[PDB]
Each structure stands twice: as structure tokens, then as C-alpha cells.
Design a protein around this ligand. Structure first.
Ligand code: HTU
Length: 67
């Protein structure tokens, strides 16, 4: 399937979008989940599971569609 393909891509839309969206309130917590998402993948290599990151991020990415 992908697993990582979903992690490598989302990381681009995750930050780039928020960095270009510039907002507050809803964006305040939105970034909190972002900084943690980028640090997990870039750092994780053997542990943490790749399927666990693509599933969780699914919530963040979907949130970008609105913002
Ligand atoms: S990951 C990320 C990047 C930029 C923001 O403004 C927020 C989250």
C-alpha cells in the first residue's frame, strides 16, 4: 500500500498550509498537532509504527481542507 507515502506527503500539506493559512483559535491547537506530527516521522525509524502515524494524521490533513 503506502503507510509512509501518506506520512511523507501530509507533512508537506500539514506545515505549508498552516504557514500560509495564518490564523488563530482553531489554528492554535491545529499547529500543536502539526509540530508533533513532523517530529514523529522525521525522528521515528523503526518504532512508532508507520500505520499509526498515517491514521492519526488523517485527522489533521482533513482539517486542512477547511483551512
Ligand atoms: S507543521 C506547522 C507549520 C506551520 C504552522 O503555522 C503550523 C504548523
Amino acid at each position: 500500500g503506502s503507510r509512509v507515502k501518506a506520512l511523507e506527503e501530509k507533512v508537506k500539506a500539514l506545515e505549508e498550509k498552516v504557514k500560509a493559512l495564518g490564523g488563530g483559535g482553531r489554528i492554535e491547537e491545529l499547529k500543536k498537532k502539526c509540530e508533533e506530527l513532523k517530529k514523529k516521522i522525521e525522528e521515528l525509524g523503526g518504532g512508532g509504527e508507520v500505520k499509526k502515524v498515517e491514521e492519526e494524521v488523517k485527522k489533521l490533513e482533513e482539517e486542512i481542507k477547511k483551512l
